[PDB]
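Case study B.
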Amino acid sequence: KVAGITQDFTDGTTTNTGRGLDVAISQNGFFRLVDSNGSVFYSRNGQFKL
Amino acid sequence: TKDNEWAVYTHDSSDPAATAPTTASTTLKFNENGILESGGTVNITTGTING
Amino acid sequence: ATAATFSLSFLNSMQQNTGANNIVATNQNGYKPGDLVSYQINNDGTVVGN
Amino acid sequence: YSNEQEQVLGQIVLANFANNEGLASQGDNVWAATQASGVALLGTAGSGNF
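Model:
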């Protein structure tokens, strides 16, 4: 059988880039976004816009 | 216009001989629990074209 | 709108020198209206619509 | 601002779950919380276990 796809949730390399609107997270935690429909999602990829 | 009252106006867009709207068609009035209460049915005539 | 009156309870609190002040958990049972976007079936047999 | 004033516009909210490996990958670099993960448990970047 196939029980499930598991994911390795360890954080990785912190790489500097020098932009202004770029955030990273050093430990546990997720950014929290809403969509156009009101669905609430969670993320780790910090690269924003305007 | 005010809280829990709206006014709907009509226009006939597919013909150029339409009267300019000077009188609103009808008012809609609500509850304070957001439910429609009064003035929801109205008899409207269109314009005419091609006979 | 009809004004909301509600019973507010500070139960299960403590005063025991926990560094600074902090808020652990707030809960209330009201919601603005919405629409259905998805449904699913969990493992215990419950149909859950978000 | 241009009259030597500072204005806060909001604070970025982190959130973490009591159970990972229960999140569902839902497209792009984006997850989604369901059953077998729990409630959101959201806060700020300083205190807690964030």
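The CA atoms of residues 39 and 45 of chain C lie 13 Å apart. The remaining cases will be described in the next quarterly update.
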